[PDB]
Design a protein around this ligand. Structure first.
Ligand SMILES: Nc1nc2c(ncn2[C@@H]2O[C@H](COP(=O)(O)OP(=O)(O)OP(=O)(O)O)[C@@H](O)[C@H]2O)c(=O)[nH]1
Ligand SMILES: Nc1nc2c(ncn2[C@@H]2O[C@H](CO)[C@@H](O)[C@H]2O)c(=O)[nH]1
Ligand SMILES: [Zn+2]
Ligand SMILES: [Zn+2]
Lengths: 381, 375
């Protein structure tokens, strides 16, 4: 299967690049605030074409760091804390000749194998190092051993290292940043390319005026439309050089808000009907495409015939089902609008049983529910 | 010598607006608020208005843009413009719709234009104004008086399908006087009664209060929030019709919609430059000011002033600002960049204190030209 053809399944990306300047601002700018009364993760609205990971819908190398990718021209890319590898899968479609070195923490929580890359690309042939036969310690980016064994297959320098790992504290993030630096300055292979080595990593801009480790200079800060509205998540492009400050909550919030108020979510050019069906069946077993009044009423019929392990115990499973159908029915009866938080705020505040929904469905179920919602909204008119 | 209206249309800038359709449902959801405090003191809504002199209402509101579908469906042969002043809104309409004839009205007083000066400058001749209100009293040109409405058909025998009002009223009571009289006419008048309830009044309104009921049998169809309206206020254009009455737009609804256009959208510049109009505004701002405005042109004005201290103080203030605009980097036409321009100027309060409302509006037109002229 052609990678460039598969690229039409990933949506377009809207973002803001805040280039780090040595010279002071000297502006004294106002603040941009808009309190969206939303309870659902609407950043999954354009991610219906994906199942196990959908990071590729949020961040893209060709979109954000396209010029650096062109200039440096990496033969191999290093993906750490990647999970099911959907951001790595998008990269494989945008750059069809690049090989990959994948690493992800080996635990029961989430994934430690690229299930989505396997799904999108078809085969793991381009993943020259998938971290097979490694310990939990050697797959942890906060440990020295992870960095020591990074070249066990690939002998190419760490020109562009991609990190989408979620850390406990900022101290764990610092552990990784320090270890990256220690490697790129010690390693025989890497030392050859010098200071022109990059680490593009996910960071949550909590505080302000926080100094990066020594000889770690942030080049730019990327604020994604795909990042959760509630937080202060961003992607920082780091390099070796005279250290500077991590992005502050303030700047991130102003940029985060402009994107939420102004821009609309771009839908995918093509529809992966097998992936949509998978998410539909993942949300509610037996859910079929297209989702219409007829399709919804049969799901209402299927639960009626079941009621007419304990007998009282199965009432929990049917309660979840009703909640899902009630929401999808509400989306169906809702007028078509543009994919934006103003319209999403309207959808939620037009629904009477909103709090019952959040109470009855888990975080993963509600994310799945948004993928299905997004498909339905795109399917309209 | 021949003046084409469609060619003249390239002098009016593009319009950005938000239409808030009034829904019978009587069920509005609970929403959040959008706030951004722009530290601005100048009427920046005049930046894209350099090509106009006496009136520039057409830079802000347009019939083809805002109510193009209604203009198509109800194809009006004649349009009625009340409280029009120099008639720049009417002039834009004449360019967008080259076959429509007009009936013009504006209050006959020393305080405002009671003759379409801008229409004349744009179109060339008053041939399409079949009724310019010639030989009428101040009472018969006041939209709050019955006699104004009684004599509206003295020339035109076409129904009031679309009535345009850009009048500024003292109280909301005066606005209500007009709205009531429009209704009284469109329901009494032999000519108008024929078209029934499908008659419209697109009037300018300041959304001050909330949950204010429109007069009986007067129903608002939609509310238009213009980018061209002053940021500070709560000015909007309401499209009214005959029907079971509803509520006037509330200050609340407006402010969010008003703010979005300020944060998101940029001011579109005019495709062509009316160099005669620019020169007129330049000479209106400061006598002897010539285009292009450059370091050489500004230093000449500094020199000319060296050889009545009140008049020279105003001149220095103007030159100081234009010099600041000249030395300023080119940016996009938006409130973020405009906030930067006056945040970068040290004598901001002296400016507002030394120049009148009309002078500052002229100063912004000249500023807009200079900003567009860059790079
Ligand atoms: N919460 C959240 N997850 C995001 C966001 N952007 C990307 N993600 C990633 O997407 C994952 C959840 O989406 P999926 O992998 O598509 O699907 P899911 O199988 O329904 O979910 P989980 O068990 O919650 O991971 C998260 O664990 C993140 O790795 C975001 O803004 N918010
Ligand atoms: N939008 C807007 N237009 C104005 C304002 N004041 C005057 N104008 C119009 O703009 C023209 C400027 O010459 C005036 O003749 C009026 O028609 C204002 O505060 N806002
Ligand atoms: Zn190395
Ligand atoms: Zn009549």
């Amino acid at each position: 299967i052609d990678p460039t053809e598969q690229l039409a399944y990933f949506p377009k990306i809207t973002f803001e690049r805040l280039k780090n300047y040595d010279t002071s601002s000297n502006y004294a700018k106002g603040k941009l605030t808009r309190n969206y009364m939303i309870l659902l993760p609407w950043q999954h609205v354009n991610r219906y074409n994906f199942v196990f990971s959908s990071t590729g819908c949020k961040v893209s190398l060709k979109t954000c760091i396209g010029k650096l990718m062109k200039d440096l021209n990496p033969k191999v890319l290093y993906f750490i804390g990647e999970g099911a590898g959907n951001w790595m899968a998008r990269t494989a479609c945008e750059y069809p000749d690049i090989k990959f070195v994948y690493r992800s923490l080996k635990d029961d929580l989430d994934h430690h194998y690229p299930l989505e890359y396997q799904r999108v690309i078809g085969e793991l042939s381009r993943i020259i190092d998938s971290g097979e036969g490694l310990s939990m310690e050697t797959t942890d980016a906060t440990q020295k051993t992870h960095w020591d064994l990074i070249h066990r297959v690939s002998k190419d320098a760490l020109l562009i290292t991609l990190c989408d790992a979620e850390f406990k504290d900022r101290d764990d993030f610092f552990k990784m940043v320090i270890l990256w630096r220690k490697h790129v300055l010690s390693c025989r292979i890497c030392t050859t390319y010098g200071t022109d080595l990059y680490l593009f990593a996910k960071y949550h801009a909590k505080d302000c005026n926080v100094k990066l480790p020594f000889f770690v200079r942030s080049v730019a800060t990327f604020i994604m439309q795909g990042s959760k509205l509630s937080g202060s998540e961003c992607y920082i492009l780091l390099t070796l050089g005279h250290h500077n400050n991590l992005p502050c909550h303030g700047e991130i919030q102003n940029s985060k808000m402009k994107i939420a108020v102004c821009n609309d979510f771009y839908a995918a050019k093509k529809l992966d009907n097998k992936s949509i069906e998978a998410n539909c069946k993942s949300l509610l077993s037996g859910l079929r495409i297209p989702i219409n009044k007829k399709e919804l009423n049969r799901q209402r019929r299927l639960l009626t015939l079941q009621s007419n392990s304990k007998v009282i115990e199965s009432k929990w499973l049917t309660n979840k089902a009703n909640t899902i159908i009630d929401w999808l029915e509400h989306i169906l009866n809702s007028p078509k609008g543009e994919l934006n938080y103003d319209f999403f705020e309207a959808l939620e505040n037009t629904y009477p049983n909103m709090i019952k929904l959040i109470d009855n469905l888990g975080n993963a179920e509600i994310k799945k529910l948004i993928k299905v919602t997004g498909y339905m909204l795109v399917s309209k008119k």
